[PDB]
Amino acid sequence: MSEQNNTEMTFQIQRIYTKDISFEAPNAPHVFQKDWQPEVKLDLDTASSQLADDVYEVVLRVTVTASLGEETAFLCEVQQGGIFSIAGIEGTQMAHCLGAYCPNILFPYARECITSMVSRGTFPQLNLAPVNFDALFMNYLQQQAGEGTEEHQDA
Amino acid sequence: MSEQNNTEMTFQIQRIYTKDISFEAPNAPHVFQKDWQPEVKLDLDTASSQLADDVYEVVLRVTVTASLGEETAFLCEVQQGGIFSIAGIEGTQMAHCLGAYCPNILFPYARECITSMVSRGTFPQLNLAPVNFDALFMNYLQQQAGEGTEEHQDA
Amino acid sequence: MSEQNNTEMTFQIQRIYTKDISFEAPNAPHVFQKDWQPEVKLDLDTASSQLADDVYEVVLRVTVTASLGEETAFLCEVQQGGIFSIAGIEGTQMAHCLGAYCPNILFPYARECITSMVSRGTFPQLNLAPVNFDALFMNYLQQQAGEGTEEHQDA
Amino acid sequence: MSEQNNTEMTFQIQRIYTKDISFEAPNAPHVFQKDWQPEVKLDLDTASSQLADDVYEVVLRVTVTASLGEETAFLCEVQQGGIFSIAGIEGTQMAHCLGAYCPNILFPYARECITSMVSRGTFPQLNLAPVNFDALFMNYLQQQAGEGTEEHQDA
Amino acid sequence: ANQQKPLLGLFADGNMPVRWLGPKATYHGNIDKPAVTCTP
Amino acid sequence: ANQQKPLLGLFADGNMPVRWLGPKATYHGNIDKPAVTCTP
Amino acid sequence: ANQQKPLLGLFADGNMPVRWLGPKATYHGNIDKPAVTCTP
Amino acid sequence: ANQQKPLLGLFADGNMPVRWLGPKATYHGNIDKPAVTCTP
User: Rounded CA gap, D99 and D138, in Å?
Assistant: First the structure.
């Protein structure tokens, strides 16, 4: 609870990689009867794991569903995982780091991965709008700090 | 047997696409530190479908599985579907059309879909090597091999 | 089951990749006040280079230009190269292989690299139709194949 | 030469996209024979043009030049153009937001577009580390003399 | 003491469903009509 | 250009030309309006 | 009422065994790692 | 009549002092095809 460390948070990018993909078109040939703007649905899920000491692994899931009437258009889901060496983070600074800053790094890759699979189901272009996860999460916490003095040297 | 190569039969591809995509990298964060010897087990599932009269769809589930001894790297399972308007085909003519020709139309597209997901998971690129479905089916059906190579330019 | 097949084209892939990628959108902001109906022209160029004995790299440069006259919608171009090993035969026999089969292996990869660039410019995705070059050669001649054993004993 | 005023701040992204892309593998199958740990270079460039009323486009070019051994590994360049609704920020406030915040938005999408090209060229995908542009620009703002006007307003 | 503490607290407790917004939408008017039928 | 070029015999001949089916099937619009009117 | 088509009566089964043409594993050595560069 | 003075025109020259965070750190291995002798 407000562990005042000498190092006010730490962030290092270690890896970004696709961990999971799903794209289902259950009525793929028959959806031709339901042709135009489908009801698209977003749902983001947060998964994490600690691989080693100060080495963490944040998975940002972006699920996209589409359907017209009572039948499906296309189903898609990506899990863009990313290894990050993070330490010093606490409370608000923790939640803002891995819950806003790190997802927003993984998001462009997850976005293009969905865009690829939709094209494999041979449907028109799906470009998701830029949501500022950083500022949106600051608004979730009303307002918070995102400014500090650097302290970095060989140790 | 009864290959019966008459000017009968008709073929017209209307559309090619993935009806299902699956990419799982179960121990992705743990695999990129492991010994560099996965056992890549390939799988192929054959399934045809009726969409309309004389319109027959073909789906090939190409499943790629890699495990580094005990721990799985990734799983690339791609049900590459393809709508093909075929008529005039019976017996071994339709058995070769579906058992060799039209699956090999979708094989480069399943190959590509897999390769892309493998490389998106930040794993070495997998190029599925040319398997001539025609030849291996011929080895059973009517046997196909032989060339008259013996003479050389002598002076 | 007793026939000596010898020098029948021995084909194997080494490595497929994008030698080059490109996208342009000069009229990119301007496209808002444009009519969305371009005269899309396919502009392809094909090269080959010997890397070793029987090893020929086939390059398939595909360019998709979308312009409703001089009014350019977008530009996309990929040089999809593939290291291919075609052994045993030459001339018209190998012209069937490199000039028909090899483009069909590079075509799915060229296609997705083009589509990705169109989707990065946030334009409606373009899936290229199944163009079978080999079909034309199949009606003519040199379609005769069936794997066996090469020699390499004649300089 | 000074200016202190504040109109009703507005900042909304209308569109993010690639205006120009290039991945060049000049020594592609030549380097692969001895293609090991790359020594990388990062060049940055920008472009600008007002599109409409309170609508200003910031283009951010990231360039990635790899060289390993005695020659080039691969080349990468992406002009990530973004349509922004910029109003209400002015004086040194605008100068800071322009130099820091606006290209920081574009940088995740620029990074991704490079990362995907490199993996398609069968090279190791490059994950650009998140670097603070603000700190770099602090100096540049203290090293200029030629503001838009001179009108000393104060509290 | 069953009193344990995983460092991963402030994150994976609940998902965040983003409210879908898109005035221009995805689909417009590109589908099977001038499809792959005309290949003589 | 003479007679026989061993281990080749296409592409350098003149490049095999590809014709379209119809550009009507693509590019009926994806970016109408200001595309994204609001950014959270 | 069901139209049993005598044309479709095959290709629900693995017709012939497909050999794997990528032995010695898809590596032949090391790769990248779970570490990009640095920050200090 | 003079407006939009700081509005879009701060930096244009380019080349920021990004000397990387690690000038040489991406991948290392041993490239070769997995045996790949013949398709028969």
Answer: 9
| Contact of B96 with G16, CB cutoff 8 Å | no
Experimental method: NMR
Pairing of strands A71-85, A55-68: antiparallel
Q: In what order do the strands lie in the sheet with C72-87?
A: C39-52, C55-67, C72-87, C10-24, D10-24, D71-87, D55-68, D39-52
Interface test with G, best of A10, A11, A13 (most G CBs within 10 A): A13
The chain C residue lying nearest H39, using CA atoms, is C12
Strands, sheet with A71-85, edge to edge from the N-terminal-most edge strand: A39-52, A55-68, A71-85, A13-24, B10-24, B71-87, B55-68, B41-52
| CATH number for position B149 | 3.10.420.10
- Total domains in chain C come to 1
Count CB-CB contacts under 10 A for residue B146: 13
Q: How far apart are CA C148 and CA B97, in angstroms?
A: 23
CA distance G38 to G33: 13
> If you write DSSP's letter for every residue of chain B in order, what string do you get?
------S--EEEEEEEEEEEEEEE-TTHHHHTTS-S----EEEEEEEEEEEETTEEEEEEEEEEEEEETTEEEEEEEEEEEEEEEEES--HHHHHHIIIIIHHHHHHHHHHHHHHHHHHHTT----------HHHHHHHHHT-------------
**Interface with F, mutate which of D9, D13, D57 (most F CBs under 10 A):** D13
Burial class (CB in 10 A: 0-12, 13-18, 19+), E1: exposed
Token digits of residue B123: 């794993």
Helix (H, G, I), strand (E, B) or coil at A111: helix
> Does D12 contact F37 at a Cβ distance shorter than 8 Å?
yes
Closest partner CB to G26 (pick from B32, B50, B124): B124
Query: Domain range holding C92?
Result: 1-155
Query: Do chain C and chain F touch with ≥3 beta carbon pairs under 8 Å?
Result: yes
For residue F4, CA distances in Å to C59, D53, F7 come to 22, 65, 10
Instruction: Answer yes or no: do F34 and D13 touch at CB < 8 A.
Output: no
3-class secondary-structure state, position C38: coil
3-state DSSP call for residue A145?
A: coil
**DSSP state letter for A100:** I
Cβ contact C11–H39 (<8 Å): yes
